[PDB]
Structure 1
């Protein structure tokens, strides 16, 4: 055996590994597959039109003569492989690196490591009390926020609406993490599935890897002892703003009184006006050095409503 010198070698605590996030995806219930890294130019341009491809001289066939532009070609080939073999409810993901053409790059194409995936089929797999409901975007985003924004930041992460010509305009998003396009989530276009014949509603979620590859090392702080109380607020808003100015501006008003914000019941029944909605906004108000009694709670509930009238709505009268 060899004779070496035991230099330790450098590490880092404030970053991630790939195997940790992969072991988390296996905990949530996802198979890991590996597909072909060069795909079909016929059903490759049907996902990303506009951006041209990196073609390939001397191919193997016409079926494999184009580099990737995303990871949604081999994955939507694997799904329709499995669904044609009388085998449903396939949850897969795959980590590889894509090839986007550029001009100010190293060799003419810039390459990013990418983490992608596909969820589809049934949610709960036919259980004795859990009902039969196929999956949707909230399930994908909830199972994704644990992937991205738990082992990373969750400091500021905004979901907005940015279009893409491969998926639905409404049931899709654009994850940010402090003013950068980092991801694309949501169900594919309902006329995209007329080609390839992907029986049943599928969902896809791509992520740019080495910008979420640094966690934060935590720091202690003094913790109080006193209990807190649960205040119920039901703000009436028209059906225009989803959650951007409802659940977020509540936290910024007062840096010593408001911690925590929940939601447990929507209100679009018969009591509310049509085209309008009420979101139940519960809070757990507490103070860092003393307790909170009935006088100072009425200041911080009313101050958030004073900061809410700049969104053309206010609280409800019930």
Structure 2
């Protein structure tokens, strides 16, 4: 919201400077994005009168005879250029901002243009360049510099938050400043009214949309340019002057956050009817675009006989036909409160955002229409010579605001502050509340205009900011937390250790978007995604991640194509989406592997992964093994499910070459699994002082037999007295059964109390010979010291 210093200064005279106003509004709750200085106007620009406008035969141009102190001519191509108005005349020599070259007397179509008359764009006060700036013909004595009546302005760019619609009027702002203790000057609205009937009625067929709707009557209007001071103010606030009555309606509005519109009575017929629009009903709006209305749209309409016609798009934009122009002699003045939701819908439904809507979306003072009518009527009287009736047409009976219970003690308590009651109650009054009662709890009712004041705590913020957030002390709380809150952070902590142990292990972590490309489900061969975007950033980002790994793969590609790294060990932890939201951890290997970069031997691929992993779980203290189970997105030859502590949690494997194909990369190795990881509690095993019993013997087994089944079997029968059971040599070839294989197993035993006799050994190992040979196995080796 453009807030022009000099304009605000009219309501709050004592303002020190644009900058202390910036900091002042800051404490009030209003941040200023920029502070700009705006109307630099050079010596060369003088005020002048158009005595005559003379078409130049053969051209679309006019010769302007100007009284500019002396008489001069200029040529202008401007539509509005015409006699009886004042213009801004840039004389030869003038350095204008918006043209860079200088201004001289040049010759145009037969006539020496002694400078030129300016557009708002040319002068530098507005964006408009389609016409001459037009002033009252008498605004200044002919020849005087514009500077003298058009000083530079500074204008702050304030953001006004939705809870403060009253702040969408400068007088709104002033009230706040007033509460800080600055003097306020409310504009006096001098009306010389006349007792007589309004030559038109009012029929509001939709109180839903217009819970309050007033019309004022002004007649005998002398439509003309606005005075300089209003043109200046309006231009500073980002609006462009049109004339007299239109300008006054914009000026009020900007003043008291109360959009309003003057309809020319010519077009109004018997009356104004504020109603819903009939389907397909049409309307050419102000901005000059032909539109087609929706039944949900609330229109300001007129009627004549059995004729009903839209006049404007209520609370958004007026119609083009009834807009007030030079030949208008009387108007109906619309000043209302509209249904915020309806206006909102209409506005979006039509691709319109206006100062008028917006204020109606955010909300307007439900009892401000009448005060507003008066201010406008008054101005219209002052600037357009309006005669105006005493009576308004009025529809709607809005209730005043209710009182709110308020306790200075709660206020001080809620804030931590120590403001004296008396000070609290006074601030509340400066902001315009009524405060009844004697305490401890007060009856305090807000001004209708503070939409944001409903609750007692609303009132406290009110004393807080007026008093200063800086006047709030600093402090720290002490309390014994309630029991249900104990160790409530266990989960979060668990996951952080995971991450941290992971960095220590050698894994690099990476964050991936939670989105997924729906096409990817086919690509990486996943079941479809269940959650979809009713409004994605783009089709590639239109669903929700069902797996962490696709993103891992896609990100390896992405920096092979960039930094050609030779190897990677990534890990991601993210939320994934399917049935329920669950936490996942995915890892990724790739490339040469690890060893001596100058030598040749390397560890890599699947068992490198599985190696890093069984190490991870070594550290988490969890049991770990992987079995045989295909996964659509893996190798049918390198495919395993992960089994931590005996229950399935995800998969380990090497990417599917057919996918490695489609995505154009070497063999990648990955894993993915569900968090949280199973916890295993300490079962501290007091060791054994007494010595251990070592012996080795291998097992001859068919080729397809998974290492698991054997290890499992050797173990489960090995006995209640086993220690290190581990594998130390995989041999395959002669002299074994036409393609079998033997597994070299290191065994160790031990007993807590006593010591291990050769009897209990050789026995219990032959007890393993039992379920081993009695399954189809047998020993390549036996009893090797």
Class of the TM-score when normalised by the shorter of the 2 chains: 0.7 to 0.9
- Pick the aligned partner of 2:507 from 12, 30, 33: 30
Q: How many angstroms apart in 2 are the aligned matches of 1:35 and 1:6?
A: 40
Partner of residue 201, structure 1: 667
State whether residues 521 and 527 of structure 2, in contact with CA within 8 Å, keep that contact through their aligned partners in structure 1: no
Instruction: Say whether the 8 Å CA contact 1:123–1:132 is kept in structure 2.
Output: no
> What is aligned with 1:103?
none
CA distance in 2, matches of 1:243, 1:226: 32
Give, in whole Å, the separation in 1 of the partners of 2:647 and 2:635.
21
CA distance in 2, matches of 1:122, 1:270: 32
**CA separation of 1:76 and 1:254: change in aligned 2, threshold 3 A:** closer
In 2, the alpha carbon distance for the partners of 1:260 and 1:57 equals 57
Match of 1:104 in 2: none
Query: Which consecutive residues of structure 1, in runs of 5 or more, have no partner in the other structure?
Result: 101-108
| Alignment map for 1:277-296 (pairs within 5 Å) | 277-296=741-760
Q: How does 1:145-224 map to 2 (within 5 A)?
A: 145-148=614-617, 150-154=619-623, 157-177=624-644, 180-198=647-665, 200-210=666-676, 212-221=677-686, 223-224=687-688
Q: Counterpart of 1:136?
A: 605
- Residues 271-282 of structure 1 mapped to structure 2, 5 A cutoff: 271-282=735-746
Contact 1:41 1:66 survives alignment (8 Å) = yes
State whether residues 167 and 189 of structure 1, in contact with CA within 8 Å, keep that contact through their aligned partners in structure 2: yes
Change (3 A) 1:152 1:289: closer
The equivalent residue for 2:533 is: 56
**Matching of residues 47-126 of structure 1 within 5 Å:** 47-88=524-565, 89-100=567-578, 109-124=579-594, 126=596
Q: Compare relative contact order (CA 8 Å, sep 6+) and give the higher one, 1 or 2.
A: 1
Q: Are residues 1:4 and 2:468 paired?
A: no
CA distance in 2 between partners of 1:153 and 1:91 (Å):
22
TM-score w.r.t. the length of structure 2 is: 0.37
Q: Judging changes above 3 Å, is the alpha-carbon distance between structure 1 residues 305 and 22 closer, same or farther for their aligned structure 2 residues?
A: same
Structure 2: distance between partners of 1:268 and 1:176: 28
Structure that is richer in helix per residue: 2
Distance change in 2, residues 1:220/1:160 (3 Å): closer
Q: Which moved more, 1:55-64 or 1:82-91?
A: 55-64
CA distance in 2, matches of 1:142, 1:165: 24
Give the structure with higher Rg (CA): 2
1:240 to 2:715 alignment: no
Q: What is the aligned residue count?
A: 304
Gaps spanning 5+ residues in structure 2: where?
A: 1-474
The answer to whether structure 1 residue 299 and structure 2 residue 773 are counterparts is no
Judge conservation of contact 1:39–1:67 (CA < 8 Å) in 2. yes
TM-score of the two chains, using structure 1 as the length reference: 0.86
Cα distance per residue 1:149-176 (max 9 Å; x no partner): 541432xx55221221100122121123
SS in 2 for 1:173: strand
- Shift of the 261–241 alpha-carbon distance from structure 1 to 2, 3 Å rule, reads same
